[PDB]
Ligand binder design. Structure first.
Ligand SMILES: [Co+2]
Ligand SMILES: [Co+2]
Length: 214
C-alpha cells in the first residue's frame, strides 16, 4: 500500500508574474495508478489575475501518471517521504517562469508547497493580454542526470486568434530518499481547465498522464 487507488490533494501556491504577487489554494483528488486527477483552485490574493491562468496550470505531481510494470516509477517509490521538483518554463517571447513544488503525504492526502515566479512577459504578448486557450497535449521526456531525474517537454498554447505560442519546460525531480532510477522514458500528458468563472478566481483543472517506453 502507501500509494492508494484514490487519494487527495491540497495545495498552496504563492507567486508573482512581472513583480505583481498573488496566491492561490486548492483541493482535489485523483487516481495514481490510472494517472488521473482533478482539483479546484481559488485565488486568495492578488486577484483578479492580470495574466493568462494557463501559465500556472502545469505547476498545480508526476505520481498521477500511469506507469506500466516494465518502467520504474521514481515518483511512487519516493513516498511516504515524497519528493520535490523545480522547473523553468522558457517562452518563445522571452517570458520566463520558475516554479518549485515540495510534495509531502499526510494520510491519503498530498500536500504541495508551491512557488511560482515569472518575469519579462511583454505587455502586448498573449500571456498578459490573456490570449491563450489551452495547452496542447504533450510528451515529456524523462532521463537521469547526476543521480536525479530530469523531465523535458516542448509545450504549446493554442491562441484564441489561431496559431500557437511555444514554451520549453526543464524540470528536475528530486526524491527525498534513495529509490531506483528509471531508464529513458516518456510521459504523455493532457491538462485541461474544465471550468472557470469570469476572472478565473475559481478554476477546475483536470489531467491525465501515461508513461511509455522503448
Ligand atoms: Co485527453
Ligand atoms: Co472558457
Amino acid at each position: 500500500s502507501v500509494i492508494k487507488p484514490d487519494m487527495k490533494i491540497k495545495l498552496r501556491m504563492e507567486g508573482a508574474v512581472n513583480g505583481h504577487p498573488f496566491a492561490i489554494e486548492g483541493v482535489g483528488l485523483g487516481k495514481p495508478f490510472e494517472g488521473k486527477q482533478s482539483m479546484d483552485l481559488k485565488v486568495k490574493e492578488g486577484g483578479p489575475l492580470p495574466f493568462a491562468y494557463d501559465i500556472l496550470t502545469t505547476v498545480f505531481n508526476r505520481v498521477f501518471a500511469k506507469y506500466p510494470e516494465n518502467i520504474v516509477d521514481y515518483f511512487k517509490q519516493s513516498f511516504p517521504e515524497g519528493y520535490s521538483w523545480e522547473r523553468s518554463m522558457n517562452y518563445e517571447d522571452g517570458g520566463i517562469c520558475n516554479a518549485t513544488n515540495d510534495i509531502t503525504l499526510d494520510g491519503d492526502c498530498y500536500i504541495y508547497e508551491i512557488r511560482f515566479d515569472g518575469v519579462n512577459f511583454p505587455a502586448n504578448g498573449p500571456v498578459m493580454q490573456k490570449r491563450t486557450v489551452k495547452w496542447e497535449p504533450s510528451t515529456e521526456k524523462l532521463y537521469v542526470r547526476d543521480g536525479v531525474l530530469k523531465g523535458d517537454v516542448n509545450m504549446a498554447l493554442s491562441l484564441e486568434g489561431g496559431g500557437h505560442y511555444r514554451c520549453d519546460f526543464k524540470t528536475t525531480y528530486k526524491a527525498k530518499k534513495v529509490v531506483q532510477l528509471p531508464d529513458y522514458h516518456f510521459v504523455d500528458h493532457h491538462i485541461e481547465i474544465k471550468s472557470h468563472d469570469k476572472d478565473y478566481s475559481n478554476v477546475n483543472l483536470h489531467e491525465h498522464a501515461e508513461a511509455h517506453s522503448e
